[PDB]
């Protein structure tokens, strides 16, 4: 079987600029049948490129396809806002076709530090048995945010949940949203709830916390 | 152009069987591959299998090799993907992908590369049932910054399957609405949240409701948020 990797995992780059994305695979690539997908959220994968150069009609000459073997190399050559989405490579040389792991290219912009917000759980829900904490990161930069969940000054682990939104497409900030889940009695059992979380765009980790009932 | 149509979403127990088909339009059918791709939530794409209906042959991937079976009905220029002994695991979208070619018909030239995809089909795989989500109030902080901004919003939780669609004030508030991908919970049924930064000088005075619309359990729910009365 043919293994394909993709390089680097996440290409952050700004608008205007010149993206390399490399695919190497583990042996060689039959006849060049090499070809490079774009996919945007929501919507089905499109070919960009095929025959590891050939181009579709009706696909923008920016993006232009080489290499050979093992090494291929998807080229666009100023990248446009709508470039920035997800690729794959795919070798169809083989009757066992392989697609590769992707690679991400993302908005490089100025860092912006997250706004957090904490929110205990309603009553309505309360009425439910069950108490969720929503500790919410709005609109940072870059992707990587750390949040970690403090009751009673303990720490947490294992009981919270969180995902991120896509790279928005007017800031290119991102966005987190932690849930931390508990049953009634073991929210009643403690005081104090807090989320702190650490971002590059912050100096010192920032804390937001509530105290139950009050 | 050659257009691709997929079967509806599909709901089903761990065990089960699921048929997915894709409907080809314009072009011939008969000559070129089509090939079935699956992509689970927030992961890559993954090559399930081919066949080329001419010649009735299939060939598919060591991973799904025993359990899948994919056929191409050229009474209909409809193809199919059967995925037997369903698991969670299973739960992805399923694209069908016909390669391209250059010209038309039966001596039109093969591209290889998939050029054709079809919208995809849904397939969850859970022990779960359909039930329709409890939206609770993320009420805003009364410790908001005063004239400054403040964070609401609504948590939809415990709901199955997927999708779910959440608007503001019924689509008139769009600015800074984050609406975040859905969690797979423990308890196998799915949980989101979608909150709004707005002034909070009009935290006291103007109206913010969440609404939530779960198709798959035909669920409309319209949620009202206010500061608490504390
Ligand atoms: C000179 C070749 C043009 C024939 C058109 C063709 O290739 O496609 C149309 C039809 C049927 O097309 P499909 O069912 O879609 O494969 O095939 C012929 O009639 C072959 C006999």
């Known amino acids: 079987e043919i293994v394909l990797t993709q390089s680097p995992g996440t290409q952050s780059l700004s608008p205007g600029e010149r993206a390399t994305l490399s695919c190497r695979a583990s042996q060689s690539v039959g006849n060049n049948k090499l070809a490079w997908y774009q996919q945007r959220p929501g919507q089905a994968p499109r070919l960009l490129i095929y025959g590891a150069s050939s181009r579709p009609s009706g696909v923008a000459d920016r993006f232009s396809g080489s290499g050979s073997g093992t090494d291929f190399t998807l080229t666009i050559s100023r990248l446009e806002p709508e470039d920035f989405a997800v690729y794959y490579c795919?070798?169809?040389?083989?009757?066992?076709?392989?697609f590769g792991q992707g690679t991400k290219v993302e908005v490089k912009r100025t860092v912006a530090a997250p706004s957090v917000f904490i929110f205990p759980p309603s009553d309505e829900q309360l009425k439910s048995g069950t108490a969720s904490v929503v500790c919410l990161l709005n609109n940072f930069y870059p992707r990587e945010a750390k949040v970690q969940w403090k009751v009673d000054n303990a720490l947490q682990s294992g009981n919270s949940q969180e995902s991120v939104t896509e790279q928005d497409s007017k800031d290119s900030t991102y966005s987190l949203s932690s849930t931390l889940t508990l049953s009634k009695a073991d929210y009643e059992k403690h005081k104090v709830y807090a989320c702190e979380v650490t971002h590059q765009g912050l100096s010192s980790p920032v804390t937001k916390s509530f105290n139950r009932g009050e | 152009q050659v257009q691709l149509v997929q079967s509806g979403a599909e709901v089903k127990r761990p065990g089960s069987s699921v048929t997915v088909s894709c409907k080809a339009s314009?072009?011939?059918?008969?000559?070129?591959?089509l090939s079935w791709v699956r992509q689970a939530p927030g992961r890559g794409l993954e090559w399930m299998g081919g066949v080329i209906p001419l010649l009735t042959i299939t060939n598919y991937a060591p991973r799904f090799q025993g359990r899948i079976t994919i056929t191409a009905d050229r009474s209909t220029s409809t193809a199919y993907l059967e995925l037997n002994s369903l698991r969670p695991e299973d739960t992805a979208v399923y694209y069908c992908?016909?390669?391209?070619?250059?010209?038309?018909?039966?001596?039109?030239?093969?591209?290889?590369?998939?050029?054709?995809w079809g919208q995809g089909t849904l397939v969850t795989v859970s022990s779960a049932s359909t039930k329709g989500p409890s939206v609770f109030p993320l009420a805003p902080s009364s410790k908001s910054t005063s004239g400054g901004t403040a964070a609401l919003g609504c948590l939809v939780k415990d709901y199955f399957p997927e999708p779910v669609t959440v608007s503001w004030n019924s689509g008139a508030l769009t600015s800074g609405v984050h609406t975040f991908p859905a969690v797979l919970q423990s308890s196998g049924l799915y949980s989101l949240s979608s909150v709004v930064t707005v002034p909070s000088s009009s935290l006291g005075t103007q109206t913010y409701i969440c609404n939530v619309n779960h198709k798959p359990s035909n669920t409309k729910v319209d949620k009202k948020v206010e500061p608490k009365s504390c």
């Open positions: 795919q070798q169809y040389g083989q009757s066992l076709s392989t």
């Open positions: 314009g072009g011939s059918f008969s000559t070129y591959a």
């Open positions: 992908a016909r390669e391209g070619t250059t010209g038309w018909g039966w001596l039109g030239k093969p591209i290889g590369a998939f050029a054709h």
